[PDB]
Amino acid sequence: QKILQFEDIMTNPFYRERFGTYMERIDKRALVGFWESAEHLKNANKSEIPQLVSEMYQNFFVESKEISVEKSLYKEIQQCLVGNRGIEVFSKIQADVSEVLRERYYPSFLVSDLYEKLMREEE
């Protein structure tokens, strides 16, 4: 047996496809998938960009969600996201979390022991 460097595996579609199937076993194919899609992107034509960027957002931030990927995204676009409109962005998220708290948790809280104990505080 002779041993392949990480770089040679990734820059070779044969080996890279195989590494893909290993990651599929641990339900992680999306990491390789993201890597391939990002490589495809920096050597595509200008015309192809909006579509491939859209396809990648769909595939890797709504249809799948690896945390390492989300971490990097949010780090790099912070200034774009909240440089100015910090208040308006947080306000929009707050409205959505408000609705989840109200519809999904508040009702069960009301029948919780913790809520009954709060109510028999007449001291």
Place this chain on the structure above:
Amino acid sequence: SQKILQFEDIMTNPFYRERFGTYMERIDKRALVGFWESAEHLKNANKSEIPQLVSEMYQNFFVESKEISVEKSLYKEIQQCLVGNRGIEVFSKIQADVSEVLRERYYPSFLVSDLYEKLMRE
């Protein structure tokens, strides 16, 4: 039998809101209340404090924390940051981070995998 608080009264009251917080902590969800409090703090703070508090909240709830699917709220605004050139710069930087995760955490186990031995005798 029992006095029933509206959702609104719970959130606008530190006593009731603390209690609702502990109920959520039980089911490992206290970050939803925590996020609500931090956002309320923000829109009623002093103007000088804002950039720093926005920064600290972004760090706590986008970068470091897991329990809020932030992206549900903001699909358009995130994609607006990915248009044209910014898109390439950002995905390239994400790819570099993923490159390092692949290299450090998975490649080594791949190398000792059955999949790798089968690849070699060809």
